[PDB]
């Protein structure tokens, strides 16, 4: 069977104040870490605020990471620098990456071979908008958004994939679990069909839409949804809740 | 005006070099009173570098975001960097607007920003090769500065940094009468638009090439308040070049 993955984005939020309250809940749920991988990303900032106040059973990473190694990059944080402070995870290619800071298809691919060069586990996002969706383009998308980064999985534990329903996200339109399994169905294939049939059966794909305390429990049942990565849910004590469901 | 020496790290560093280089660095004895020196490490450094340096240095980060805090995966907000008690910022470096698509305008709401949480702010700007070849140099650097200085009400929290980018990869130097001649043109900036007690008030240091050979030279020109260090600033050897502005 997977290994369930329950991740905590917690986006550009928190204080030294909140994150030790935050934190401190989080602890008081007892879980197996080498059944369940539960990940908490803060801002680069509260790396080591959150690393040292969380459980060794919870596992820490970073939003972002550089397609630079170690030189002149003024605001950049390698791979390097990440795997010489035991950072386990990485985020990439985020949606909201995509939107503000031009991030493309070529830049995540960057970011995977220098994260997967230096160790570190990727935690790797794409999806399609609302205009894409409309005009049926969604295995299109995807495809092409898969395709530019899979070749480099050398481990299908270690690299994590993340549908975000961006037609789903800021607009009117709501996104059912089985909307998000079927597209997860297809993930899969593709990863069977360019990488193996093990190392499809092997990869974690998590949905990465609004997951909530009340909707978590029928994501979690779809049979190709591996789990979360959270976002506002995940900067309450109630997530917690949200990490039981997989549990 | 008081001098401002600043080690910009940029993309570099271990737990362990940064050790060795915080060591030497707390082995010179200065006054912070009448020489600011602000050290710049990665911002997953940023707590184990000011942990080892003594409060004499002050510590900030390499860029800082022009949001707030929200859904901004990655980003680093100036809400943040205040509840931290991060001192300084470092906004407009030239490789941010070369890679990171980093414009005038992400500078200004950078400032804004920044301003608006009690950060104090390195703010860079500079002109190309083929810009200063074409006479351009003060058209470019006139309006880089215009889109920012407007916000600026204490001429001690802002401190500007000017980068001879057609000095930087080329083939090219830039003389200290050079860089002094473009420090003047800056501060003319700040008079022709703020006034002559601001211009006489704000630091205007050096972003260019910089090392222990030539940093007494560039000190010593009448407009250079001191510099923003790169690549030097990884040595240990970095304790001379304060040395020059002390």
Same mark, same amino acid.
Request: glycine content about 6%.
């Given at each position: 069977?997977?290994?369930?993955?329950?991740?905590?984005?917690?986006?550009?939020?928190?204080?030294?104040?909140?994150?030790?309250?935050?934190?401190?809940?989080?602890?008081?749920?007892?879980?197996?870490?080498?059944?369940?991988?539960?990940?908490?990303?803060?801002?680069?900032?509260?790396?080591?605020?959150?690393?040292?106040?969380?459980?060794?059973?919870?596992?820490?990473?970073?939003?972002?990471?550089?397609?630079?190694?170690?030189?002149?990059?003024?605001?950049?944080?390698?791979?390097?620098?990440?795997?010489?402070?035991?950072?386990?995870?990485?985020?990439?290619?985020?949606?909201?990456?995509?939107?503000?800071?031009?991030?493309? #298809?070529? +830049?995540?691919?960057?970011?995977?071979? $220098? /994260? *997967? !060069?230096?160790?570190?586990?990727?935690?790797?996002?794409?999806?399609?908008?609302?205009?894409?969706?409309?005009?049926?383009?969604?295995?299109?998308?995807?495809?092409?958004?898969?395709?530019?980064?899979?070749?480099?999985?050398?481990?299908?534990?270690?690299?994590?994939?993340?549908?975000?329903?961006?037609?789903?996200?800021?607009?009117?339109?709501?996104?059912?679990?089985?909307?998000?399994?079927?597209?997860?169905?297809?993930?899969?294939?593709?990863?069977?069909?360019?990488?193996?049939?093990?190392?499809?059966?092997?990869?974690?794909?998590?949905?990465?839409?609004?997951?909530?305390?009340?909707?978590?429990?029928?994501?979690?049942?779809?049979? #190709?949804? +591996?789990?979360?990565?959270?976002?506002? $849910? /995940? *900067? !309450?004590?109630?997530?917690?809740?949200?990490?039981?469901?997989?549990?």
């Amino acid at each position: 069977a997977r290994k369930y993955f329950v991740a905590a984005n917690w986006k550009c939020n928190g204080t030294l104040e909140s994150i030790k309250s935050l934190t401190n809940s989080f602890n008081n749920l007892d879980f197996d870490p080498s059944k369940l991988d539960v990940v908490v990303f803060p801002v680069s900032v509260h790396y080591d605020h959150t690393r040292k106040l969380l459980q060794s059973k919870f596992s820490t990473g970073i939003q972002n990471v550089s397609k630079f190694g170690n030189g002149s990059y003024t605001g950049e944080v390698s791979a390097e620098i990440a795997k010489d402070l035991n950072i386990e995870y990485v985020i990439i290619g985020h949606h909201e990456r995509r939107k503000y800071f031009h991030e493309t #298809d070529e +830049d995540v691919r960057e970011k995977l071979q $220098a /994260s *997967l !060069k230096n160790n570190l586990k990727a935690v790797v996002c794409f999806g399609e908008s609302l205009e894409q969706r409309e005009q049926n383009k969604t295995i299109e998308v995807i495809t092409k958004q898969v395709k530019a980064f899979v070749d480099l999985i050398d481990n299908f534990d270690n690299v994590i994939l993340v549908y975000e329903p961006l037609w789903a996200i800021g607009t009117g339109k709501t996104a059912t679990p089985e909307q998000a399994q079927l597209v997860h169905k297809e993930i899969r294939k593709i990863v069977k069909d360019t990488c193996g049939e093990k190392q499809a059966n092997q990869i974690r794909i998590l949905y990465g839409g609004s997951v909530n305390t009340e909707n978590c429990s029928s994501l979690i049942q779809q049979e #190709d949804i +591996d789990g979360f990565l959270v976002g506002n $849910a /995940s *900067l !309450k004590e109630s997530f917690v809740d949200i990490i039981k469901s997989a549990m």
